[PDB]
Every structure is written in C-alpha cells, then in structure tokens.
Ligand binder design. Structure first.
Ligand SMILES: [Cl-]
Ligand code: NA
Ligand code: NA
Ligand code: NA
Length: 173
C-alpha cells in the first residue's frame, strides 16, 4: 500500500542531492510510523538541511526517534516540531541529544497540545548550558528564570560561533 510519502521518503534514503529539505508540516495524511521512517532515513543522510514536521500529530515516540537521529546526523541545521503532541519527555530527550550534536542551530516547538511545565523548562535551561551551537530556540518559556537564562545562552552561543567563523575566515587569510 504505497502512500504519497513513498517518493520523498525514498529520496531521503537515496541521499538525493536535490532533496535538501523534508517539510511535511500540516500533513493530515501522515502517520507517526511514517514520521519515524523519515527520521530513521535521516540518520545517515548527508543532504537534508531542514526537517520540518510541524502540525503532524507527532508524539513523544517521534521525538525520541529524532533525539537518536540527532546524535548521528551532522547535516540538519533546522528542526521544526511546532504544533504537535510532544510532552516534556520528548523535548528533554532532544535536549539531551544536543549534548552530542554540534550542527543543529535552530530548534522550534511552539504550541504543543500541552505545555511542558516549569520543571521541564528548568532542565531545558540546564541542558542548554552544555551546548554552544544552538542559536535559535523557538519556544516561549512560561517561567522567567529559564526564559532569561536561555536567552543569555543563545546570545553566548551566537557570540561564540561568530568568533569561530571569524577565526576560520582569518585562518586562510
Ligand atoms: Cl533521553
Ligand atoms: Na536509511
Ligand atoms: Na550529531
Ligand atoms: Na578583525
């Protein structure tokens, strides 16, 4: 029973050099199994820069798969998880994976079905301390402490990566 996602999934699996994004945002036809299949196909894909699956009913199982994938994938720079069913458990799995990923620069997960809660926000801020490459975090923190801490950490990271880009440019100047 071939779905409409067969071709894009197989392009990812083939490392199609023209398949530079996977954007399945708003796909009413997609399933959690297909989302996991895309996620596993991305582990060793070296082309895709964006994985966007906003508003696809993605749940914690999809987020766990994504966390695993982020430990392998060195190519995706932007990940859109907005408007799904992911809980603090899924979000924290991803921030734990970001302890072992230095290439993702944008993560967003606005408007989940349920807020993640203050305890999760605190642990997000703690985990982010250890990652110096995330530059954009699309989430509005309910608690001010995590909110301002994360804002300061993203600024830290932006400053650090600008320093590293100048250094790299100067290196062969
Ligand atoms: Cl975890
Ligand atoms: Na694969
Ligand atoms: Na990685
Ligand atoms: Na200078």
């Amino acid at each position: 029973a071939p779905s409409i996602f067969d071709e894009p999934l197989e392009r990812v699996k083939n490392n199609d050099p023209e398949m530079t994004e996977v954007n399945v945002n708003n796909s009413d036809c997609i399933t959690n199994e297909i989302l996991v299949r895309f996620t596993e196909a991305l582990e060793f894909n070296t082309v895709v820069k964006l994985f966007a699956l906003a508003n696809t009913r993605a749940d914690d199982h999809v987020a766990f798969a994504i966390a695993i994938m982020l430990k392998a994938n060195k190519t995706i720079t932007s990940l859109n998880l907005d408007s799904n069913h992911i809980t603090g458990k899924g979000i924290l799995a991803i921030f734990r994976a970001l302890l072992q990923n230095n290439t993702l620069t944008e993560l967003r997960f606005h408007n989940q079905r349920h807020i993640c809660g203050g305890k999760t926000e605190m642990e997000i801020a703690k985990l982010l301390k250890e990652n110096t490459t995330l530059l954009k975090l699309g989430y509005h923190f309910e608690l001010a402490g995590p909110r301002m801490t994360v804002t300061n950490l993203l600024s830290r990271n932006m400053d650090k990566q600008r320093q590293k880009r100048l250094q790299e440019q100067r290196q062969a100047q």
